[PDB]
Amino acid sequence: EKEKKEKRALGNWKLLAKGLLIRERLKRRYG
Amino acid sequence: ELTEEQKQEIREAFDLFDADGTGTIDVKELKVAMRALGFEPKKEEIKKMISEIDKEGTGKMNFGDFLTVMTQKMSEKDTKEEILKAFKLFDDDETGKISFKNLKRVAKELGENLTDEELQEMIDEADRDGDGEVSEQEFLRIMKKTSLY
Amino acid sequence: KVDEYGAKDYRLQMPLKDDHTSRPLWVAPDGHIFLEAFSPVYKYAQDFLVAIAEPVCRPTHVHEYKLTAYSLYAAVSVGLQTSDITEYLRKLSKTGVPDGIMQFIKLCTVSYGKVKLVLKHNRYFVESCHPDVIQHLLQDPVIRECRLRNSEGEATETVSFEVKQEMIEELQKRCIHLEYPLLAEYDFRNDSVNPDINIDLKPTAVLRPYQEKSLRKMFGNGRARSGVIVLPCGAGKSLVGVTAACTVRKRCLVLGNSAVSVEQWKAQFKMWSTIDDSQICRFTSDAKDKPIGCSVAISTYSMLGHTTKRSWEAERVMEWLKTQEWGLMILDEVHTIPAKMFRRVLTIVQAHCKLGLTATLVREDDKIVDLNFLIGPKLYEANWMELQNNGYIAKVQCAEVWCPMSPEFYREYVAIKTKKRILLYTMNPNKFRACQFLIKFHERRNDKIIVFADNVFALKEYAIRLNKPYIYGPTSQGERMQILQNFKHNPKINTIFISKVGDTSFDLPEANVLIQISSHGGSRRQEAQRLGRVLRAKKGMVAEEYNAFFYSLVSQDTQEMAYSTKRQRFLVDQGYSFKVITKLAGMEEEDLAFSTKEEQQQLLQKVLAATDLD
Amino acid sequence: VNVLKGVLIECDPAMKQFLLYLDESNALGKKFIIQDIDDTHVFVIAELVNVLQERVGELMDQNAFSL
Ligand SMILES: [Ca+2]
Ligand SMILES: [Ca+2]
């Protein structure tokens, strides 16, 4: 149970990181 | 594709400790060779990489293994630099830590609808020293064990 | 012989006679047949070709048919010999019939109707009037294993012999190898083990002329013969099945894809057949009925193919089904049968006469050669254009709308090479604006709008931004039915977003505008069947040749172009036209979302946020 | 003055983005797309434009079906 909870959090972290990068990437294109 | 010109730098670094042309260099000189190309490893990391390079106890590495190790170190260095830049993106106030406020601000700016309870759960789950937040080293570790990057 | 241009030099093998205009047929020695529709003898030629030749393409002017061994077997089962067929071909062919085709017809027809398979006392017997063929086939090692043997391993002794049920489908393929195909003949009137059932045809049921012709062709010499009949969606295929079941008067089994199909079949049986409700039972996972006295049973393939342990009551029902002998079996959507699990259902179920009904038979995995022996040869296939002319079905107005890709998406589209690339072109902001304008135009025109999108994320995003109901994987059945009723009855809501589940998982309400945004990846038959099921004939616009509207939004310069081109091949073979629309008139005046480029940048950010996981 | 002699290419913005991707990813190899001038116009050295046209034709060939 706890393991899988952490897994979800891990994915969230990854998603969050990607989000910033993605936004930053578009900034490099448009900022 | 790893590099084109930096490979020659690795060749020069290998040849610095291989003036006799024996084809191999001492593993104990691994620390200096990394410092010749700009790397600054720590004692624990040096011991861990010497253990992996010298599993058979030969004490010498050939050109291919040295080149592979240097490429891996360069990849890890650029990954760490990108992770540090991401940390700075999180740490907009330059406090050195990704506190609850920083994570909440990043989540709100990105448009995520993650609950504050989930934010503090993730902070605690990635909190190792128990300081109440995530530090540079904790963020680096959590990125290391992430799904991918 | 091949010319330098690639044309097959068939001039020498086809002796042309001076009866050019009168005779409408071209018979090339390769097995293909060409027919001219403007010829005065087109109707007779069409009837002759349908009986013996499997059509390939039916455009407006010249139709192309193919000659196959299964088609020859079907023609023989109809009751036509080689002599009359050859005479009719020579009377209609512009050139002389090549001897290669003649020898091809002679060899196949003689070998047909020799081997007979009889299902009696829950036992399968292979018998023939020529014991020499039976003795010769015994030497085959595959036939030796398929043949049922005694408990001690000794082989069992018009002499017939029992054959293993598990090896029945194996024997069917071996008959092709031995060139002695089985005969699917049933004692329609001589049956005595299975009593008749108090089921008749209500006077409200009317058989259309093509439906009646197909039924009469199936009932060769008054005996029901196993086979497959292809009819367009909405042409009363369920009515045809009910009529066939009433005619058979024996035990009837019907199989559908889901519970919705079971309910529709039960409603049609109650609507057209006179069988009592007590004799109608549903072997479903939720609504279960006692199999005792079940004259007609309606179920699903996966229910009968559940390899995992089933419920105790379901086990009892399966045991009763296996014990019970079924004179007639009905299968819906034959295109999914080539699956191994669903094919195993045929072995599991013991039935005398099996009839399969569907809209298309061109599997993308081309697993149809074995299907020709799983059930039988294709009994009948109606012409879509001809039925459109008759007014039985709506004359659909098909169009492919090319939506330009945004440069920001296009660069990322080329950059991405994995399967994540689907989200980029399926979420084109220009495509979104085109879909929004089409929805606005059809709502101002008071049209029923069905937006189909295979991608769950894209469909959900489109429906949410456009504020329309969305149907996807879970789609709780109560809420699904409520949404369907709102679409049918509420005039305020006339736009429904449906995911891939709209193909066969439930019943599609009659509509007039169908817009396809996302593609499966080259499902040339699945989306064609979906389009046929979505659009039905609408009163009021019968005179107009464009009464049903279908639009396919395709991203320019993407792989979606190739998918659309591959998919529309089946519909083009049916004579359906497709007009390419690059510019939509009225978009300039109408205000649409993402008018500013920064909004498209926001949509790009949202799409990129949706990683390869979605 | 320092001015380059080549061939001007005019295409839609989608093709412009495709050429920019080719130049950046070095799929064409050496970076012959030296400089961009306008949102629809580019300046390419004629030594590689012939091969570049082949690459563009390959792109549209893939975005189609073979009959
Ligand atoms: Ca802070
Ligand atoms: Ca910390």
Give an overview of the whole structure.
This is part of a larger assembly, with chains A (31 residues), B (149 residues), C (614 residues) and D (67 residues). Chain A is an all-alpha fold and 31 residues long. Helices cover 94% and strands 0% of the residues of chain A. Chain A is built from 1 helix and no strands. Chain B has 2 domains: 1-76, Recoverin, domain 1 (Orthogonal Bundle), CATH 1.10.238.10; 77-149, Recoverin, domain 1 (Orthogonal Bundle), CATH 1.10.238.10. Helices cover 58% and strands 3% of the residues of chain B. Chain B has helices at 6-16, 30-36, 43-53, 63-90, 100-110, 116-125, 136-144, and strands at residues 25-26, 60-61. Chain B has a two-stranded antiparallel ribbon. The two termini of chain B are 18 Å apart. The relative contact order of chain B is 0.09. Chain D has 2 helices and 3 strands; from the N terminus they run E-H-E-E-H. Chain D has helices at 13-25, 46-62, and strands spanning 7-10, 35-36, 41-44. At the A-B interface, helix 1 of A face helix 4, helix 5 and helix 6 of B. Bound molecules: calcium ion (2 copies). One calcium ion (CA) is lined by residues 91, 93, 95, 99, 102 of chain B.
Key features of this structure:
part of a larger assembly; 4 chains; A: 31 residues; mainly alpha; rod-shaped; B: 149 residues; Recoverin, domain 1; 7 helices; dna binding protein/dna; protein-DNA complex
Topology:
The structure is cut from a larger assembly and holds chains A (31 residues), B (149 residues), C (614 residues) and D (67 residues).
Chain B: H1 6-16, E1 25-26, H2 30-36, H3 43-53, E2 60-61, H4 63-90, H5 100-110, H6 116-125, H7 136-144
Antiparallel strand pairs in B: 1-2
Helix pairs in contact in B: 1-4, 4-7
Chain C: E1 25-27, E2 32-36, H1 42-52, E3 54-57, E4 62-66, H2 69-78, H3 82-92, H4 99-111, E5 115-120, E6 123-128, H5 131-138, H6 141-146, E7 161-162, H7 168-178, H8 209-218, E8 219-220, E9 223-224, E10 227-230, H9 237-248, E11 252-256, H10 259-272, E12 280-282, E13 296-300, H11 301-304, H12 312-323, E14 326-332, H13 340-348, E15 351-358, H14 371-374, E16 378-381, H15 384-390, E17 396-403, H16 407-415, H17 421-426, H18 429-444, E18 449-452, H19 456-466, E19 470-471, H20 477-489, E20 495-498, E21 513-516, H21 526-534, E22 548-555, H22 559-573, E23 579-581, H23 597-609
Parallel strand pairs in C: 10-15, 10-16, 11-13, 11-14, 12-13, 14-15, 17-22, 17-23, 18-20, 18-21, 19-20, 21-22
Antiparallel strand pairs in C: 1-2, 2-4, 3-4, 5-6, 6-7, 8-9
Helix pairs in contact in C: 9-10
Chain D: E1 7-10, H1 13-25, E2 35-36, E3 41-44, H2 46-62
Antiparallel strand pairs in D: 1-3, 2-3
Bound molecules: calcium ion (2 copies).
One calcium ion (CA) is lined by residues 97, 127, 129, 131, 133-135, 138 of chain B.
PDB class: dna binding protein/dna
Keywords: protein-DNA complex, DNA BINDING PROTEIN-DNA complex
Entry title: Initial DNA-lesion (AP) binding by XPC and TFIIH complex 1
